[PDB]
Amino acid sequence: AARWDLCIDQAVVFIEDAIQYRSINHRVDASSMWLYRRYYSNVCQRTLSFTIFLILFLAFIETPSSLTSTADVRYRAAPWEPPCGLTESVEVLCLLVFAADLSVKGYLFGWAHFQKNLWLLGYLVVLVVSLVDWTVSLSLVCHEPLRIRRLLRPFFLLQNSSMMKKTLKCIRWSLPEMASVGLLLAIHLCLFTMFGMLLFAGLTYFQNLPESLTSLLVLLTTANNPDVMIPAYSKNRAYAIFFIVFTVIGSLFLMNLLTAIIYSQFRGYLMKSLQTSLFRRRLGTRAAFEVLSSMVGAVGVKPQNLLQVLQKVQLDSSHKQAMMEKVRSYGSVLLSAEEFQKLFNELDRSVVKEHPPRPEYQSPFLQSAQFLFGHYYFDYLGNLIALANLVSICVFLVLDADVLPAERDDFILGILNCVFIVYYLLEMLLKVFALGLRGYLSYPSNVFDGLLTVVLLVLEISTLAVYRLSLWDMTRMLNMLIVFRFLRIIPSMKPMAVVASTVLGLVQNMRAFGGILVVVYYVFAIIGINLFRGVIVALSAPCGSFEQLEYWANNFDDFAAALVTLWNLMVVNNWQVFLDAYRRYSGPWSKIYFVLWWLVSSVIWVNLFLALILENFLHKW
Amino acid sequence: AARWDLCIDQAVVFIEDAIQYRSINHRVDASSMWLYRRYYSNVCQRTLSFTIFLILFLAFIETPSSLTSTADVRYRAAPWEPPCGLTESVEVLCLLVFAADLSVKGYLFGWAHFQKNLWLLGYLVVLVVSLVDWTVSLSLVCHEPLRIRRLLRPFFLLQNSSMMKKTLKCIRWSLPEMASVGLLLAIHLCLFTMFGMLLFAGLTYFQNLPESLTSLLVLLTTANNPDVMIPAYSKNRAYAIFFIVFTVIGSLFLMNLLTAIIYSQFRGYLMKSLQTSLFRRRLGTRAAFEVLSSMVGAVGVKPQNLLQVLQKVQLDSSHKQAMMEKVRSYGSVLLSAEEFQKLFNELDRSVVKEHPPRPEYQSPFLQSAQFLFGHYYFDYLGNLIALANLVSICVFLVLDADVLPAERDDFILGILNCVFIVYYLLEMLLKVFALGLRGYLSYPSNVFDGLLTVVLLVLEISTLAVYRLSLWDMTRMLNMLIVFRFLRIIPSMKPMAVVASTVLGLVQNMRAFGGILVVVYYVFAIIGINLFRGVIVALSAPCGSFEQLEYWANNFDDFAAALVTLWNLMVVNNWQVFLDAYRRYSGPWSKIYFVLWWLVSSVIWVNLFLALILENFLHKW
Ligand SMILES: CCCCCCCC(=O)OC[C@H](COP(=O)(O)O[C@@H]1[C@H](O)[C@H](OP(=O)(O)O)[C@@H](O)[C@H](OP(=O)(O)O)[C@H]1O)OC(=O)CCCCCCC
């Protein structure tokens, strides 16, 4: 009856879930399995992965606008303030796509599963309180600067991906073991300020208690390492032993225990979670076996239906072709459950595909050429001339600088460059014969090479059309692309190839743990906008201050300058100066914001991002 | 005959070599085994370990002398130049102790073993060329500044210790696998200077090729991270993406691959060498079995001689007592070789020793007290009052600063401090009754506590004798010791105890890999003296230069200021300024010295020192 195909559609959903590591917890009906295949297709999810990009992009356009060519305070125009209809209009279109998504994700699962899963409760309460905020931002007037719904926008990014859920749970089970050091770092920082204030009371860095605390917090990351030593080391030579002992205990040892203790528990709890992701793979092969053995209602499956199921599944070609021969390889056997999971080990075989070389209408001139050009020396001799073009730019660049920069001689550089553009033209025209245009475009290193020979050919005739011999600007862009062209020797050489190829593999694991950085920037910038928006005005400074250096571009006026001021605080150089500005301009209690940013960004996250990659880099050798 | 005791003295030397991991490769005679026990005793080797400290200490006294209270150039006196007899006289006494050491180490081993061992050849040629240099430094006159024998002085430190030999071999088998990145870091640094010079040619950091190279080398370690961005980011907002991409590739990723690749091969080759050190331990038990089984000339040993051999060996008490009962535990058994190495597994048992509490002549008042004081709460309530004394200093220190620092009120702090000195007096006088003076001095935490109660008692009556109520200076040293006293809560608390106790265990492994830092400082300081000795003279500066900041104390005039200028270069903050000074003062070719110092100190050594400790810290949990 109708139980034949219903067992089949119960089997296609399980084996496709067995590929992409999703939990087998559904409300399996006839109609829902039509809905399930459409939601996890690459046409519906590529709009959900597109609209999350749009709402985070909407911070570039809102009323503290960032569409200005500069970012100074001394000279910048007014940014184009948009009319306040179109700002909030594109928000509500991108919220009525998540209003469909929560209803689909909730209908496909049980209501009992809904009440136990705390993400979907959090996906609910965030969606409602944003919808109340969209009313009140329209209802009174479009003049409220404080937009609370802008803070909740990274929650839609964390809800989508299934690995940023895992590593956020993973950080929570490592911070309780941090407290044996975070207490130990506090007593070390608190004893040295009282011991520091008594020694130099018989320099202006220690004439106060909150200054001497904030001057040893800066020394803890060595951001002012000679400057805090000088007026006490010049007085007596033995006072340098106070600051030598402090940086050895605190900066070199205690700050590095905070890295190693957090990571060694981060490695333990993560591998337990990634072990769970492998468990759902073997359950999908297991759950497919139960319904297909129930098609009879020995202990096995009839191979006649097994042609039909792997025909319908979404896969590659050779992954489908090897499976379709092996199900044809048997007759009337009853494929057991261990034999069923003997079958699906094919999915971990990396495959290679290449196109055949092209012949011509003639024999003898054809065969003599591809014996030479395919020997991987023709793109080795092309590497040497790429170095020959690069040194001529360097020879040009060290003789003009001894003269005024008005470029007395440009003709010599032009008549050597145009020869090399003819040379780069011959590499494209010859190799397309040696491999065929479908084969020459198949290798991705030649796509990077073949594209740049086109743009150099376009630009060289362009400057020769106007100037038969902006002309300094036109020959400037020509030489920049040649230095960009020199990157081709990185995949070509033998030792540089494997270090490039492994990092290209780790981009499929950078997608998860790099996505948290977008969450941490987005929270601190909007809070950073709503605290220091217009607190810097520019209307003879001391030589070390925020004003003597021309640091006016590191404001917090708009979302594009907030993501650069927060960048120069992640690298921890010279952040004694921002604590001098944003204390003198916006009160002494602003230092809790920057100290919290130094704890989240440059201590916890950056080390745990690089330890996660550079372990997985060397593990893959 | 005389073969009885000769087999015995052949057995004492092997089992003592089985304890301290020395190779069983000797010229075993009758007379040499008298010499061998004296050379590896703790009375001869504690002079060899003392005279190596002396020659490195002699750099503090030689003719660029470092006996000056300050280290400026603006104001310092002439250092006391010693008469040139006594400088070179103490050197030759410390060279005629190594002239005995090479002859003893060579006579005890074979001449065939001498020719194959390259350390003893290096110990020879260094010893001779220093002896020629001691003549020529005396023979013409004591006026040659260049002392080549001062460079060779760390070789006597590397020759003595048997683990700095191992890790120096270990670094050599990791640098060949560095070259896949050191080439990759060079092309990345060389492409960005030509691409950088063309973009800003349509700021003064890029108007030259050697300046733009040395300005991106500084950016590679983020020592000038906002300062190099400013004049191009204020011009146009999109130019910040040039410096964001550069620090992500180079500073955060490529500089960290240089740490992880070197360490992951440093971990591999070191554990192979430490495995070899365990191999000599089981050979010493094996080589002792062969001679004692040859005392018969079943398959075993007679236990009658085995009382005599472990009686003569140098060991501890319980390590000797447990062995002396087990050899007495058997009768006429023939102890086999596996039974012989069944015996010597006792040497890996950490032992505890404690002294009994002391009673008095009376029963009832005695028993009521030690039920209370030994409950580890009496030194918990002592921790709270130590926090109560510390907060009163903090309450004092935040109210004087709002006034002028002439200390209007000191009487209030004095009449609370003297109460706490009586309180700290009662902790010593009561606990010495509760445990006995031999037991109270047995625990090392009470030695640190009991000593500071004496010095506070000495100082408190001292300021009260002169001043019945320098007096600000006398009450200053009193409050400093109280903050020093607060360190006692670190071993007392539960979570802080295990993090303190493990690092105290790692000092017996810090002795090896920390000794290389003394070699790297000693080479670069003497070279640093002989290149920039008197090249800084002080006779309105730009606001960012070496002269506006008062950096005059970071000279290279003497060996004590060289070890501080090299310290502020190991921490890599503000070393753009030294490259501005020591290029403008001593030629542009001095930058090879500082760049080589940044490669050896703050890239290779510091990371490999901390990765070696903080792995072994967390491995011991
Ligand atoms: C904003 C108003 C309230 C909203 C707050 C929302 C907070 C919230 O619901 O999370 C609950 C879940 C727990 O619930 P839980 O369900 O366990 O969280 C994960 C998801 O279920 C995930 O399901 P998939 O999406 O299908 O992958 C599963 O794979 C993971 O298991 P695994 O580890 O074996 O891989 C779970 O760890 O995770 C937390 O425990 C939060 C800890 C956050 C750490 C903070 C770091 C500072």
Ligand SMILES: CCCCCCCC(=O)OC[C@H](COP(=O)(O)O[C@@H]1[C@H](O)[C@H](OP(=O)(O)O)[C@@H](O)[C@H](OP(=O)(O)O)[C@H]1O)OC(=O)CCCCCCC
């Ligand atoms: C100055 C004029 C010339 C003098 C130069 C002297 C250079 C020199 O003789 O060393 C030879 C030995 C090789 O000879 P080698 O004997 O193998 O060096 C070690 C010692 O014998 C050591 O003997 P003990 O003292 O009894 O402990 C032994 O334990 C180690 O084995 P192990 O690894 O299994 O623990 C050996 O690695 O070690 C080098 O291979 C030098 C590499 C230096 C790396 C430089 C780093 C940049």
